[PDB]
Amino acid sequence: SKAELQSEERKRIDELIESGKEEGMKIDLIDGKGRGVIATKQFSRGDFVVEYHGDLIEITDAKKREALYAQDPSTGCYMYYFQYLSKTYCVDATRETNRLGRLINHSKSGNCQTKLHDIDGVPHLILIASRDIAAGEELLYDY
Amino acid sequence: SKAELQSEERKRIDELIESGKEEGMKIDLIDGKGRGVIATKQFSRGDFVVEYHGDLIEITDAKKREALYAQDPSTGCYMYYFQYLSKTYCVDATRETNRLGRLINHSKSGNCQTKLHDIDGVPHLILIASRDIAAGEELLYDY
Ligand SMILES: COc1cc2c(NCCCCCN3CCCC3)nc(N3CCCC3)nc2cc1OCCN
Ligand SMILES: COc1cc2c(NCCCCCN3CCCC3)nc(N3CCCC3)nc2cc1OCCN
């Protein structure tokens, strides 16, 4: 079934998110610094690539954090605000972690795009392939 | 009356917003560039100082604009998201205008703070004095 197939797919995404292994990609190093992410395998159009992983927060805590980060003007803008059902959240990925989602550069004609993925009530912001991706390509996102 | 007095005050703010004269302040120029704003008169605690004026938009248009601005990495982050009643807006002050609200620097211990001011249904983000302000002080905001 076509419904049946989509149900399988949602389950496989849920396991990938949960476990957060982030396989099939690697850090692009320039001068000892991570500055992008490269695909190390193929992705088909519509495949899960990676979560934009940070801390999920509602607007109140968002404004508190925003005020803190305003005290350091070196800080990148890693706060992604969005709407889910009747509720308004923000994924805050400001802190430096080993997670790769937050290191993927933006491009107008990228190969990854954003999607909201629900796991029993909690929204997760994930990047899926917007086209077939070749092993060795830089991963590049748009909205 | 104390209620009566507060009602007067809301009316005076409404006229100031509407007209947008932005008096009692001036641009701080360094090397021909506006880099802050100075008070040219006194403000009492709780007085209206200035609106953070840009374009008011709901989340949908916000994400569209955000995607555009990602194409120029020189762009400042001027998008202020917030919650009003059951609705979620953003004031976008990214475009360079002659408006002074967007030129006021941030400080942890500033002299201006944010407030939402409603005028028959539309929320406006305004800066009011968080303490008595002396003529000649730099205006500095926190949240
Ligand atoms: C500051 O550096 C980044 C910020 C990011 C971000 N920041 C939050 C979004 C705000 C964009 C900043 N604009 C500039 C002006 C208006 C706000 N959102 C995202 N994603 C969103 C979901 C998919 C990936 N990815 C980001 C990757 C970033 O760096 C990658 C390595 N150069
Ligand atoms: C990029 O420069 C500015 C951004 C502003 C902003 N940007 C929107 C808020 C986002 C702050 C950026 N952070 C950094 C990391 C997470 C997001 N909001 C405000 N106000 C909000 C209401 C009262 C004044 N005022 C701003 C003044 C700014 O420059 C002043 C001259 N240096």
Taking the centre of ligand 1 as the mean of its atom positions, its distance from the CA of residue A78, in whole angstroms, is 5
According to DSSP, the β-strands at A48-51 and B87-92 are unpaired
DSSP state of B21: -
Of B123, B88, B60, the residue nearest A86 (C-alpha) = B88
Point out the ligand nearest to the CA of residue B101: 2
Among the partner residues A70, A77, A108, nearest to B71 by beta-carbon distance: A108
CA-based angle B111:B76:A129, to the nearest 5? 135
Name every protein residue with a CB atom under 6 angstroms from any ligand 2 atom. Answer: A 66, 69-70, 75, 77, 79; B 52, 76-80, 102-103, 105, 114, 125, 127, 141
Answer whether B81 touches A (CB < 8 Å).
Answer: yes
Answer whether B106 touches A (CB < 8 Å).
Answer: yes
DSSP string, B44-101: -TT-EEEE--SEEEEHHHHHHHHHHHTT-TT----EEEEEETTEEEEEE--S--S-SG
**Both tokens assigned to B129:** 């004095």
3-state secondary structure of B122: strand
Strand partners, B46: none
Residue with the smallest CA separation from ligand 2 atom 3 is B78
The CA distances from residue B138 to B25, B28, B50, B126, in Å, are: 9, 8, 14, 17
Cβ atoms A69, A75 nearer than 8 A: yes
CA–CA dist B58, B27 (Å, integer):
30
Cα of first residue to Cα of last residue in chain B, in angstroms, is 30
Answer whether A40 touches B (CB < 8 Å).
Answer: no
Taking the centre of ligand 2 as the mean of its atom positions, its distance from the CA of residue B139, in whole angstroms, is 14
**Both tokens assigned to B44:** 């009492």
For residue A77 and ligand 1, the question of a CB distance below 6 A is answered with: yes
**Both tokens assigned to A69:** 């980060």
Using left for φ > 0, alpha for ψ between -120 and 50, and beta otherwise, residue B20 falls in: left
Cβ atoms A57, A69 nearer than 8 A: no
Q: Pick the residue of B61, B63, B81, B140 with the most A CBs within 10 A to test the interface with A by mutation.
A: B81
Place of tokens 């917007």: A130
Strand partners, B124: B117
Answer whether B63 touches A (CB < 8 Å).
Answer: yes
The dihedral formed by the CA atoms of B142, B74, B82 and A94, expressed in degrees to the nearest 10? -80
Method of determination is X-ray
CA–CA dist A3, B25 (Å, integer):
62
**Both tokens assigned to B14:** 């409404």
CA–CA dist B38, B41 (Å, integer):
9
CA–CA dist A62, A92 (Å, integer):
8
Q: Pick the residue of B63, B109, B115 with the most A CBs within 10 A to test the interface with A by mutation.
A: B63
For residue A52 and ligand 1, the question of a CB distance below 6 A is answered with: yes
For A109, list phi and psi in degrees, rounded to 5. -120, 60
Domains and CATH numbers, chain A: 1-143 (2.170.270.10)
CA–CA dist A26, B119 (Å, integer):
51
Q: Is the dihedral of CA B121, B123, B124, B130 positive or negative?
A: positive
A100, amino acid identity = L
CA–CA dist A81, B88 (Å, integer):
10
Q: Which of A66, A78, A81, A96 to mutate to test the pocket of ligand 2 (most atoms within 8 A of CB)?
A: A66
CA–CA dist B80, A125 (Å, integer):
20
Across the beta sheet with B48-51, what order do the strands follow? B48-51, B122-129, B112-119, B140-142, B105-106
**Both tokens assigned to B19:** 């007209």
The CA distances from residue B24 to A38, B2, B20, B34, in Å, are: 53, 27, 12, 16
Shortest Cα distance, chain B CAs vs residue A108, angstroms: 6
Cα of first residue to Cα of last residue in chain A, in angstroms, is 30
CA–CA dist B18, A47 (Å, integer):
50
Cβ atoms B63, B138 nearer than 8 A: no
CA–CA dist B82, B59 (Å, integer):
10
